[PDB]
Amino acid sequence: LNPSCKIMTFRPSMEEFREFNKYLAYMESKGAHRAGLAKVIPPKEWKPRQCYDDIDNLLIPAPIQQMVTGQSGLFTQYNIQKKAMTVKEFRQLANSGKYCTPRYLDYEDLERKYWKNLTFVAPIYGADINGSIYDEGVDEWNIARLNTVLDVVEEECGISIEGVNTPYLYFGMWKTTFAWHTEDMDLYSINYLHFGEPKSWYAIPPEHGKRLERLAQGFFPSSSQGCDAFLRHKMTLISPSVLKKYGIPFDKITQEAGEFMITFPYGYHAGFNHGFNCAESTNFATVRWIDYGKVAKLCTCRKDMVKISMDIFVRKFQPDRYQLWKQGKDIYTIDHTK
Template sequence: MSTRLSFDDGDQNTNPRIMTFRPSYEEFKNFADYIAYMESRGAHKAGLVKIIPPVEWIPRKSGYDIENINMTIPAPINQVVTGAHGVYQQFNIQQRRQMTLRQFRDKANSEMFQTPRHIDYEDLERKYWKNITYISPDYAADVKGSLSDEDLDVWNIGRLDTILNLVNTDYGIEIDGVNTAYLYFGMWKSSFAWHTEDMDLYSINYLHFGAPKTWYAIPPAHGRRLEKLANSLFNENHQECNAYLRHKMTMISPKVLRQHNIPYNKITQEAGEIMITFPFGYHAGFNHGFNGAESTNFASKRWIEYGKRASICKCRSDMVKISMETFVRHFQPERYQNWLRGEDYGNHPEEPGKICAAAAPTINEYKMIEERTQLSKLKGNSAQKRGCSMPNDIEEANDDDDKASVASSSLNTKQVMVKLRKMPMPASNEATSDEKAAPSSSAAITKEKYDFNSIAVVRVKRLWNALPCTENGTNLLPNGVVKNTKRMRFQTKVLTLDDDE
């Protein structure tokens, strides 16, 4: 059974309802087509949709006997909630000890943490908001992995075929939980605070087993209203970071939303059901008891305008940032050059009357892309490792001093670009101190006397050896490939806790 309730029930245009779809297996087969079909029906206007999959779709044939699922939760979080009168902050404290899934289940079903007796979902919801600050639950969030069968080809959350795959195809980068699957194991009262997805992407959540989840959703057209309310209630947080809602700490009850005339919907997801969130769809919710869900992000062409104008948290290094370059280049070529210059004027899809320029890309990042492209043309078919960057034309490199600059890409990774000045190649294999200090007039020496690669190796080794370090280091990226290693998308604080007795 699922329940649905919303504020301002009288006007479908003001507050679109959360729709529920029951596709046949034939309709269900093509993921992108079915997403487009639901949007053609207006499902995206509510920010959230429920899908009841066809009976033929079985994501895990072996079932969900926890005794037979050998899984370890590396870093469960304890959710401490503070506040009062419907306005709360949630602090996710990372635990020191890992847990097996069986241990987590036993804790969730223990007398202290088990679901209280209740009449129906409405009664349980009242108990949730009444007791939200008491007995902090654990949440096994952002666990890398999948419970779906590897040979599942239809709606396999671990490998959805959408345009978000271009991040991996073009840049060779995987972002955990964004273009790979994450698992979430909850217990009674474990929650997810108000937020939109990273870069305002779509998300899919399949509840594999266990107790239901209650979801709250704000229609994307009213997302700015929620932001303004939150900014007034959490002004300090807003002053510190204009995208603080991405920290996933802000909790506002339905009662407060009604008091401020913020339209919202709620719906309960049960085991075997799928929830889809749409771009710029704010959502929050809580678990009714022990359960297991699988989730990831995905994208469509409609998302690109949202992504170009998504708010970015700059106060935390582990926040996901996705470069929009590949999407604009592939799907909006007529706007690409204007976008690179920061002159791509338009409006946020949910703010039709507000015209502004989309954020331009990081200069260094796209300069490196262009340099690598030109260099590959000059070099013909010679290969170059991903993650390496060199000046696009060695003969025009005329920096006054040797420079090393780090470009922080919008893919939440770092690429190091070493710019080296041309130097004459002496008779020996190593440049002398006099030659290193040679004036710029040395540029007149013929090209045959330059050996860019050998000079780069010598100088980088010298810089490395000169670093103040008492112990030998280890090169963690020998092949030049940079991989996102973000573990938690929840804001966490690592504390040393006493072992459980």
């Protein structure tokens, strides 16, 4: 039930861990989704990759330098594309004096430093690199092929998932930002931190997502006027100090190497990397997602954006509502706790 809607951390045994789909159903039976985000720490014997040394040779084709403007907990960001580099070169840069993690006492002290130094040196991120770095034959929690209902309709019904169910690699350095968002089509996500420094996350319960949008609309009117779903551009930064002051509930947690974070449908989240690191992620869905997909508010203002047709999901998994929905009369309010 999780009535505080606080972020839960799961420590499965190996036997609990083996089957992702089953373990996710279990997390939801304990109210994990109410917080919009959850942590799963695998048992210590499980290693998706024996040795990471080879990853030094991976090319980062399109590093992004993040240019953040604003103050007092409210910022907007834009990107400058930089020359390709290897992971090795990226790590050497991240670890330099100009880019390295500052001295800090504890995670709370580092958090204060992130919010206070955002508009000084511009950090550089490698994101959205296609690929997984799990060894071959690792069959548990394999981000490249989780086999959820997205894969079912893609594979059995020929429906296009627009590449959101394929693996992406992210290489962080100190201060790199992931700005407030929900996933494409308000899907689930999963994020494994392979190695390196931690990533801090913020999350807002899906039941308060519309409250967050209302506040963002008030503090960023020009952005709002330009696009109905402007937070989907992932360029909007809003500090925990501002959320607290305007009564938006949220929680924070720090993800360490070897841990998974899972985001739930319509769970707004943001965060920052503590230092050099490597993470792998993808989007997925369950039957409970379908009602969120059907009402997901989409980016109007650039033709590139991800749109997945919901028809097949409704026809297959909500056959009693299909007709009604095809008539534009399947109107409901989501219960985010159920």
